[PDB]
Amino acid sequence: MTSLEKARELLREFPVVDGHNDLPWALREQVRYDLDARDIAADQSAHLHTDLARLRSGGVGAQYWSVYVRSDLPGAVTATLEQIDCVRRLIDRHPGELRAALTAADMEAARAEGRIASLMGAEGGHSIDNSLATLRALYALGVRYMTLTHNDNNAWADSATDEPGVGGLSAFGREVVREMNREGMLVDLSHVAATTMRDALDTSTAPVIFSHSSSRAVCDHPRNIPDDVLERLSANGGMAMVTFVPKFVLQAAVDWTAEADDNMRAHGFHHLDSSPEAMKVHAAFEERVPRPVATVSTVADHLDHMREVAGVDHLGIGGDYDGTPFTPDGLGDVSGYPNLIAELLDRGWSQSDLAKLTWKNAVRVLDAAEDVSRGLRAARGPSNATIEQLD
Ligand SMILES: C[C@H](N)P(=O)(O)C[C@H](CC(=O)O)C(=O)O
Numbered sequence: 001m002t003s004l005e006k007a008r009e010l011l012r013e014f015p016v017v018d019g020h021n022d023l024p025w026a027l028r029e030q031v032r033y034d035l036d037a038r039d040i041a042a043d044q045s046a047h048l049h050t051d052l053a054r055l056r057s058g059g060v061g062a063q064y065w066s067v068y069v070r071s072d073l074p075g076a077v078t079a080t081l082e083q084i085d086c087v088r089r090l091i092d093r094h095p096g097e098l099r100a101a102l103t104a105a106d107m108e109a110a111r112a113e114g115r116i117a118s119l120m121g122a123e124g125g126h127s128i129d130n131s132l133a134t135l136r137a138l139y140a141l142g143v144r145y146m147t148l149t150h151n152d153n154n155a156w157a158d159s160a161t162d163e164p165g166v167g168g169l170s171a172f173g174r175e176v177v178r179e180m181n182r183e184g185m186l187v188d189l190s191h192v193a194a195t196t197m198r199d200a201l202d203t204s205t206a207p208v209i210f211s212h213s214s215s216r217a218v219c220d221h222p223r224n225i226p227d228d229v230l231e232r233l234s235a236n237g238g239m240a241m242v243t244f245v246p247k248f249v250l251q252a253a254v255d256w257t258a259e260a261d262d263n264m265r266a267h268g269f270h271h272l273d274s275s276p277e278a279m280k281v282h283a284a285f286e287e288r289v290p291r292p293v294a295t296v297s298t299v300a301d302h303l304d305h306m307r308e309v310a311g312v313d314h315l316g317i318g319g320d321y322d323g324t325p326f327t328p329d330g331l332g333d334v335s336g337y338p339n340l341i342a343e344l345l346d347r348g349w350s351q352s353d354l355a356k357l358t359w360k361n362a363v364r365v366l367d368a369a370e371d372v373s374r375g376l377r378a379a380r381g382p383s384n385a386t387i388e389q390l391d
């Protein structure tokens, strides 16, 4: 059979545990959670990267649904609760295809019955409003990982896409990691600065993850992971879940975006300005310089290097579907995973290597977080520390 046919067979046995899908945010922005307007039980290809049929075609067996909220707007906690509510509603609306998962055991139970294990991951420490009790509340509601920062620094952690702040993690930042370790919430290092990555690895007593980050050695961009950090994963026991974002994985795209941003500033606009006037400037740039397109090969290049440095037992996949506008050819939506697996097969990846990449590593890591949590919960009570006291 073809590599694609083989890929589908392999995924039927050990499906993909995707680390970051922003369907909730997309639903929030597109229809303000009017789920009937974007029923994922129907074909949503015209509006979203995600729907149930495409997830099945793509071989997704577990999904960490992102409950991301903007860090540049007030009421982050309320918004996070609304994002969590959206995930809960989706699970309740589609019992035949989805199953809520809070543990590694739940993930296996879902796989055994043929349902997509649905977990939640918060994206940005701003979601806890400098409150450890709030962190515990999010865990109680089902959140199983939290990206320490999003695109901007918060009071206790530095973002890779912001200027240096506290120098990685502040004293309270380390306290947050300790509490996440005690609760059993995975520390997600995507988005954070390299300094923050190292501070988190020094502090965490549990395996950490990168829900959606690729290789900095392959593509030099702050959102990607440095080799020195990848090297520490084997000891930490964590995993880096490769992402598909073109402007992060394709060199030409990284350069194009940098030049597009410079062009915006050249016209007196902040590179993130979305006004009609700013859009005119960007449109003119794309007119003379077409946007480069990434491919499955681009993503495979990152996985090959990540495997060499981090090890096959420390890799995963975090597509970032519905969280980013552009996608690599062959990975246009959630139904594309088989194309990536086929490419890896053509590159010599073994069936067991691939089962680890898609399913086994993710389950091991969540189980490890649970194991570390059992020990810490029995050893001490929860922290009542405040950011004022520590910082
Ligand atoms: C804003 C989304 N929750 P995200 O998941 O943070 C997507 C970005 C890339 C982009 O803006 O396209 C990233 O992950 O770094």
Ligand SMILES: [Zn+2]
Binding pocket: 123, 190, 191, 212, 323
């Ligand atoms: Zn992100």
Ligand SMILES: [Zn+2]
Binding pocket: 020, 021, 022, 066, 068, 123, 323
């Ligand atoms: Zn996101």
